[PDB]
Design a protein around this ligand. Structure first.
Ligand code: SF4
Ligand code: SF4
Ligand code: FES
Ligand code: FES
Ligand SMILES: [Mg+2]
Ligand SMILES: [Zn+2]
Lengths: 125, 115, 48, 690, 96, 77, 109, 208, 86
């Protein structure tokens, strides 16, 4: 038996998140940038959802890093940006999406290193 | 369309009926709760808190979400009646040791960085 | 240790101490790092 | 069409002629191991880690250099490829030092990761290892040469991207070494990038040494404010502290590089910081106070004065949210004296047309030009990544470059037409051979630096350059979307301020000396107390104690660019937003929040309470400020040229001389960099040989 | 290499001592402050520099498998000495 | 190597607490039997899989060989 | 065995950038003749002979000789340093008047 | 390939493949997919409506006889439209075999309780409801089992924070244990360990 | 009480801004010649709607829709706000 519900999906009242962490939060949906210290690209394949950075302070004893933000560590992984957007929408979080940035195809040519009249010729090798 | 399967109610009318039934049960339970747990609140305070918890979710328009909310409220009622809950659990609804957090712009600006 | 003495080092304690908990010689934790952010020091002279 | 079909592991793909095996494997999403190949450097082929087997071929080929042949079948996971990778890793690790626990590359090492992924798990090397002496190439790049795997990436980057030929290899065979052969400081505005491209711990960051490991860092993708290029960056933090700055790839703007000031001035964020509100006591000394007291004093002074009496000057690192908030607050008291420290001519169109004050061609466009003229600016220090793009075009597209100004070293050869501004007129009339050169150019580009505009005859200089552009346009017609006219900015807050209706320059302040002055991060020293009446109320808001702080009556501690989500507009007019990496120190607050709280205390509460509301107001004023990463604009050069033809201000005789004459000047320019000890070390290194 | 601050508090090898206006010093009143007295920077500065007749020397910290990973130190620069990055021992070639 | 040891499996009859107690006692005896077998059949050799991308190398290798140090670092981080 | 020669340069009072070196006028005529052989725009190709010519006048190659060759040919000095340290016939230290080189490879051994 | 590599068993692989084909042929109404893992672990993906039939057939059929339910749990995959993956593990003593049955659901769709088929499920379904919030229809006594009384939210869900939203402490003014918003003296430190170089080519996904 | 600034948010390639575009193509120049001290900020618009903004003393603002306006309608509205009317 099917009842034909007409409304947008909304599960906030069932998740148990305090309303402060539903209304004042902003999530970022993005493909993380490649770490410039390395050439591997395997960490730039999936979409990520992460929350806004909140206050961190210094513990009076030991000087550790203290927080009062319960979502400061939460990172979600999605196959596509549409899935991330749907999750954020049904959970009631304001989101900012960033389009995936891919490196453009570059024309490489080893022989260009030894151009007869071009500027591309290498002064050393 | 939208091709969904219900839990208990087919439209909002049946869901509202179940909400009213659960509200009746909580209303009847409040005086017994005050007696058994030896709470220092009045019955009026307890019924006001029950109404406030019910009104927290007044904006819901999905019969399935309402059915799940009634299931959770029935779980809480069963828990309260059987004394699985302790006085600390009942008093957690009133937040008696939580300092009031302000909502206006200026006080928030004074205290810290969080909006 | 009389027939097999331990190796001698000049940083090893020459005087053993017992559990000094609950005593004015007890350990009190503290941060061992230095200050991170330095604040601006206003000039000591009047500006007008 | 011209595509050829090749197979990677038996799977068909279409590739352009001349595509290397590595790129074809990348088309199907497979990454070939590499050490010496970098897609932005010239191909080397030396490491030999990329060797792969082609079906029905006995010899493995180097995938990074070999062009795919039609009908070829790459085999990236065959036994031959795996054994090649294992042997090459073995030869690479034979002489490598056991340095991982003390190496800064530790958790970020391409050598380590590719050893784990493609190499063996054991050593059968039973000899002694080679050791080499360390080189000293300055205070920014730490050198531990034993770790070098001889990739030669540093040599290719320095020669091709940076434009310097200081690095090289001396000796041969096993004893071959990478260095300078003499005591030389590899000092350049793009030097720090050789740390990023070096795959091992041979080249590391000296300021960053030993402080953190990569797995503990939190990554915040943000934007740089050290200049007007708006380079994408990653701020790495740990336990509420900024560890370092890394490049973030943006093809359109900065590629994968950043300038040395963008990379190494972050430590200045930890020095000379304004942490608490301050007021002048009875003896005229600045002392700490509460937010309420300072805001009440400022609000009292604001209520009493209005109109022309109240004024504001914006500094170089201010964001659009704070700018619009201050604009609204001063408008509520009927004030229009909202100015910047950087002068742009207000004659004719002025700020009226967005096209007039922007780099219309864009950073990406330089790659499509064949002639560029630069007037009164040093591209290398005012916008190092822009100059890098120019050198990339000069190297790969044979771009012809001419300059009018002092003969500064741009790292690439250009044509020096002189330094007299009258030469501009000579080009505009047509008597100069460069007029003929521009006449026949398909994609001519003329760039005028904002620094040149600072001088008194700037309105005239802009008119002459616009005349040159108009002559080109009328002679050659409009090819379509080319936008010959360009303005090169150097200040991060300037374009957004102009977009908001702020009046460029501090002239109106001198014309109408105010009683209440709002210094919003303004540390340029343009307006002092000699230029103001007595009993003038000066309010400074910012994050650093600099020129603008010790001359103020009330000090309001603001947040730096790393401590807020704020909008900045670059030279292109593209709008980008920073993210919170850490919160502001002490009692410091967000700048627009300071302005909004002050407005509430003074009774004229601003309509916006959150960041989304202030960005909605931003959209109300100038809608392009909420279209992040959009750079499309309309050309209104004809109208601006008409409006510029009205006045005929005379040109000065003074030769065009940029502020950043040499490399030493490049380092300490703003308040964040002036507080940086690393920049002080860099200045000491470029002035003193040692 | 211990030394006291103007407040009478011992300064650690790290160099941290509570400031005069820092309330946190109250945690030491009626108790003590833990300070290790053997400063490693001073102790390693007393070791004599080892003279070896080769351009490249090897260090493993002593004890074989009980030391640190074995590393090779170049000794071509004569203006300085080769320092182990693990143990801190110094090496030089016979000079002058 | 449980297929290489010999032991009986205790079985009850009534499904009560008493039968479960007898089963556990006899299980204790059979464990003694298995232990005796394991003591007499312990072979020589290495103790972890000879695959340094899964199991950490020995400390002497970690302090002499570059690959061993790299694999120790990566396996422990 | 190992090479023995160092491939870094440290300034000395007898070998520094201010050590006097200059070609003779006859050597300048020879340099012009050497330069002419190569195609125009490819003047660097004369690094190998001209450097040798310097060594044939001075006896060895002080760092000032490398700087002079680099300035004459308009080649970056590090390129001349690379050439000087790569090839074994270039003397980056003074040698005797007579340089005895005995072959010890397998057929000769 | 000998000493350090786990040996294969093709006989069990063939037997499990044939039995998976058997099960799929007998119940086409519900069986969507059948898989045999490389280490011989049979998996049968089904439609949710067939939870009760499939299991019943599997426990009752003469050639099946999986009379014992090892365990029943759920997996949360937020990227899927149907968030939750319900996994039943069954053991057959007569044939000395194991089988895994998997189905899917989302936050608002109930699954049929299988207490009738297996008595063991009772607490397993209560646990799934408590940790993930998956409602089970026709369940005898469905309520929280693991979490504290009055605890809001489901901890096992991917979105839920590791340390939750509230903590407990004893308060002397009210003379009782109170729940307050979580504050941490030291924040849990998030590590980024994933290597930027691919480890397993056999699992590479198409480049989309 | 008086005009302080004008803002014209026109959309670069939408049909409903076409007439407004013509205005800036032809009639903006002389309007700036007549008003050398009045900031008329010309800005780009997103797919919503073309608009004109007028600012008065003490930060009072209200906007006028220019959707589907022809160039003459645009300049009529601009002269109406520029004069002591409406
Ligand atoms: S560069 Fe990499 S492999 Fe070499 S010591 Fe450093 S971390 Fe280890
Ligand atoms: S220092 Fe780094 S970039 Fe330069 S050659 Fe050595 S490994 Fe390559
Ligand atoms: S990446 Fe091809 S040889 Fe180095
Ligand atoms: S000349 Fe001696 S081996 Fe050839
Ligand atoms: Mg490096
Ligand atoms: Zn050592």
């Amino acid at each position: 038996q099917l009842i034909a519900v007409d409304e947008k999906l909304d599960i906030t009242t069932l998740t148990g998140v305090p309303e402060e962490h539903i209304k004042t939060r902003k999530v970022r949906i993005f493909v993380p940038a490649r770490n410039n210290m390395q050439s591997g690209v395997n960490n730039t394949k999936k979409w990520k959802m992460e929350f806004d950075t909140r206050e961190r302070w210094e513990n009076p004893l030991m000087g550790w890093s203290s927080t009062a933000d319960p979502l400061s560590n939460l990172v979600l992984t999605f196959s596509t940006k549409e899935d991330a957007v749907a999750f954020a929408e049904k959970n009631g979080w304001s989101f900012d999406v960033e389009e995936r940035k891919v490196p453009k195809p570059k024309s490489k040519s080893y022989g260009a290193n030894f151009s007869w009249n071009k500027r591309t010729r290498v002064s050393t090798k | 369309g939208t091709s969904v399967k219900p839990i208990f109610s087919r439209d909002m009318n049946e869901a509202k009926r179940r909400v009213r039934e659960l509200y009746r049960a909580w209303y009847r339970e409040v005086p017994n709760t005050v007696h058994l747990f030896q709470l220092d609140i009045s019955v009026k305070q307890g019924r006001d808190k029950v109404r406030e918890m019910f009104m927290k979710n007044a904006h819901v328009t999905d019969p399935r979400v309402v059915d799940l909310l009634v299931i959770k409220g029935k779980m809480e009622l069963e828990e309260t009646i059987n004394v699985w809950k302790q006085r600390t659990h009942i008093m957690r609804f009133f937040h008696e040791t939580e300092a009031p957090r302000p909502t206006d712009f200026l006080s928030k600006f004074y205290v810290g960085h969080d909006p | 240790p009389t027939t097999k003495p331990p190796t001698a080092r000049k940083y090893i304690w020459t005087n053993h101490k017992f559990n000094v908990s609950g005593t004015p010689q007890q350990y009190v934790p503290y941060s061992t790092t230095r200050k991170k952010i330095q604040e601006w020091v206003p000039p000591s002279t009047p500006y007008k | 069409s011209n595509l050829i079909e090749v197979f990677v592991d038996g799977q068909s793909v279409m590739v352009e002629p001349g595509t290397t095996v590595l790129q074809a494997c990348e088309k199907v999403g497979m990454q070939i191991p590499r050490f010496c190949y970098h897609e932005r450097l010239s191909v080397a082929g030396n490491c030999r880690m990329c060797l792969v087997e082609i079906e029905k071929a006995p010899k493995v080929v180097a995938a990074c250099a070999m062009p795919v042949m039609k009908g070829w079948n790459i085999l990236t996971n065959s036994e031959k490829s795996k054994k090649a990778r294992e042997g090459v890793m073995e030869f690479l690790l034979a002489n490598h030092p056991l340095d991982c626990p003390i190496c800064d590359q530790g958790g970020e090492c391409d050598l380590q990761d590719q050893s784990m992924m493609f190499g063996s798990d054991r050593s059968r090397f039973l000899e002694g290892k080679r050791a080499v002496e360390d080189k000293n190439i300055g205070p920014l790049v730490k050198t531990i040469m034993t770790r070098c795997i001889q990739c030669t990436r540093c040599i290719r980057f320095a020669s091709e991207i940076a434009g310097v030929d200081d690095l090289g290899t001396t000796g041969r065979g096993n004893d071959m070494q990478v260095g300078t052969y003499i005591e030389k400081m590899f000092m350049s505005e793009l030097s720090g990038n050789i740390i990023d491209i070096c795959p091992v711990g041979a080249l590391t960051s000296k300021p960053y040494a030993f402080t953190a490991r990569p797995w503990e860092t939190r990554k915040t993708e943000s934007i740089d404010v050290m200049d007007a290029v708006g380079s994408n960056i990653v701020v790495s933090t740990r336990t509420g502290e900024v560890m370092r700055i890394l490049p973030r790839m943006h093809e359109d703007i900065n590629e994968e590089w950043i300038s040395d000031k963008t990379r190494f001035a972050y430590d200045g964020l930890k020095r000379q910081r304004l942490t608490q509100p301050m007021i002048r006591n009875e003896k005229g000394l600045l002392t700490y106070t509460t937010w309420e007291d300072a805001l009440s004093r400022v609000a009292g002074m604001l209520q009493s004065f209005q109109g022309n009496d109240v004024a504001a000057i914006a500094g170089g690192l201010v964001d659009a949210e704070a700018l619009v908030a201050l604009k609204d607050l001063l408008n509520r008291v009927d004030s229009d004296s909202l100015c910047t420290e950087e002068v742009f001519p207000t004659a004719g169109a002025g700020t009226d047309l967005r096209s007039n004050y922007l780099l219309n061609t864009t950073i990406a466009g330089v790659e499509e030009a064949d002639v560029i003229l630069l007037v009164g600016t040093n591209p290398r220090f005012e916008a190092p990544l822009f100059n890098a793009r120019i050198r990339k075009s000069w190297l790969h597209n044979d771009l012809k470059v001419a300059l009018i100004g002092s003969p500064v070293d741009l790292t690439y050869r250009y044509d020096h037409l002189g330094d007299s501004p009258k030469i501009l007129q000579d080009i505009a009339s047509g008597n100069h051979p460069f007029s003929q050169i521009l006449k026949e150019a398909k994609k001519p580009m003329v760039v005028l630096g904002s620094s040149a505009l600072q001088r008194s005859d700037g309105t005239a200089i802009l008119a002459a350059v616009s005349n040159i552009a108009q002559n080109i346009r009328l002679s050659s017609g409009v090819t379509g979307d080319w936008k010959v006219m360009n303005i090169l900015h150097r200040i991060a807050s300037q374009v957004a301020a102009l977009d908001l209706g702020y009046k460029p320059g501090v002239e109106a302040i001198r014309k109408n000396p105010p009683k209440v002055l709002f210094l919003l991060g303004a540390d340029g020293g343009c307006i002092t107390r000699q230029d103001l009446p007595k009993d003038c109320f000066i309010i400074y808001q910012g994050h650093h104690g600099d020129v603008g702080a010790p001359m103020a009556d009330v000090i309001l501690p603001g947040a730096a660019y790393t401590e807020k989500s704020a909008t900045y507009v670059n030279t292109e007019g593209r709008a980008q937003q920073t993210k919170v990496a850490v919160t502001p120190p002490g009692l410091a607050r967000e700048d627009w929040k300071i302005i909004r709280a002050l407005s509430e205390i003074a009774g004229m509460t601003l309509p916006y309470d959150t960041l989304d509301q202030v960005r909605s107001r931003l959209e109300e004023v100038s809608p392009n400020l909420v279209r992040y990463d959009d750079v499309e604009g309309a050309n209104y050069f004809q109208q601006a040229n008409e409006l510029s033809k009205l006045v005929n201000q005379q040109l000065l005789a003074d030769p065009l001389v940029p502020p950043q004459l040499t490399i030493k000047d490049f380092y300490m320019t703003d308040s964040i960099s002036r507080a940086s000890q690393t920049m002080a070390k860099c200045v000491k290194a470029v002035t003193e040989g040692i | 290499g211990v030394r006291t601050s103007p407040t009478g508090e011992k300064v650690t090898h790290t160099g941290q001592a509570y400031d005069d206006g820092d309330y946190r010093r109250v945690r030491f009143s009626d108790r003590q402050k833990e300070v290790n007295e053997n400063f490693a920077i001073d102790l390693i500065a007393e070791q004599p520099v080892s003279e070896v007749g080769s351009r490249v020397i090897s260090c493993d910290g002593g004890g074989g498998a009980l030391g640190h990973p074995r590393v090779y130190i170049n000794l071509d620069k004569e203006t300085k000495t080769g320092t182990c990055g693990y143990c801190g021992l110094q090496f030089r070639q016979p000079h002058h | 190597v449980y297929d290489q040891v010999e032991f009986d499996v205790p079985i009850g009859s009534r499904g009560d607490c008493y039968d479960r107690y007898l089963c556990r006692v006899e299980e204790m005896r059979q464990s003694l039997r298995i232990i005796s077998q394991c003591l007499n059949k312990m072979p020589p050799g290495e103790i972890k899989v000879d695959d340094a991308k899964v199991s950490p190398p020995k400390r002497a290798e970690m302090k002499t060989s570059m690959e061993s140090l790299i694999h120790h670092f990566k396996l422990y981080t | 065995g190992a090479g023995g020669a160092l491939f870094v340069h440290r300034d000395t009072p007898e070998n520094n950038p201010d050590t006097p070196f200059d070609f003779t006028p006859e050597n300048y005529k020879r340099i012009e003749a050497i330069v002419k052989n190569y195609p125009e725009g490819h003047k660097a190709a004369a690094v190998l002979p001209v450097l040798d010519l310097a060594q044939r006048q001075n006896g060895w190659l002080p760092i000032s000789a490398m700087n002079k060759v680099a300035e004459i040919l308009q080649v970056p000095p590090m390129r001349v340093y690379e050439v000087a340290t790569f090839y074994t016939m270039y003397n980056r230290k003074p040698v005797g008047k007579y340089h005895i080189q005995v072959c010890t490879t397998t057929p000769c051994m | 390939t000998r000493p350090t590599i786990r040996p294969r068993n093709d006989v069990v692989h063939k037997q499990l493949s044939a039995f998976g084909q058997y099960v799929a042929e007998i119940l086409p109404k519900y069986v969507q997919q059948v898989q045999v893992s490389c280490f011989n672990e049979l998996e049968i993906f089904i439609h949710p409506d067939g939870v009760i039939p499939v299991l019943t057939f599997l426990r009752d059929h003469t050639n099946a006889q999986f009379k014992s339910l090892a365990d029943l749990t759920a997996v949360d995959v937020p990227t899927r439209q149907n968030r939750f993956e319900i996994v039943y593990n069954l053991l057959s003593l007569r044939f000395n075999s194991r089988i895994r049955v998997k189905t899917y659901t989302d936050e608002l769709t109930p699954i049929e309780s299988s207490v009738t088929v297996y008595k063991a499920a009772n607490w397993y379904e209560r646990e799934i409801w408590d940790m993930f919030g998956v409602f089970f229809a026709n369940h005898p006594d469905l309520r929280r089992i693991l979490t504290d009384y009055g605890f809001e939210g489901h901890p096992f869900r991917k979105d839920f924070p590791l340390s939750g939203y509230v903590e407990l402490r004893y308060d002397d003014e009210v003379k009782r244990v109170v729940a307050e918003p979580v504050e941490l003296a030291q924040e849990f430190r998030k590590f980024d360990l994933n290597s930027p170089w691919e480890a397993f080519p056999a699992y590479r996904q198409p480049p989309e | 009480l008086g005009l302080r600034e004008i803002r014209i948010h026109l959309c670069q390639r939408s049909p409903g801004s076409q007439g407004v575009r013509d205005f800036i193509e032809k009639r903006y120049v002389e309007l700036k010649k007549a008003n050398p001290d009045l900031p008329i900020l010309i800005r780009e618009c997103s797919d919503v709607q073309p608009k004109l903004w007028a600012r008065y003393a003490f930060g009072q603002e209200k906007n006028v829709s220019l959707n589907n306006f022809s160039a003459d309608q645009v300049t009529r509205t601009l002269e109406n706000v520029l004069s002591g009317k409406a």
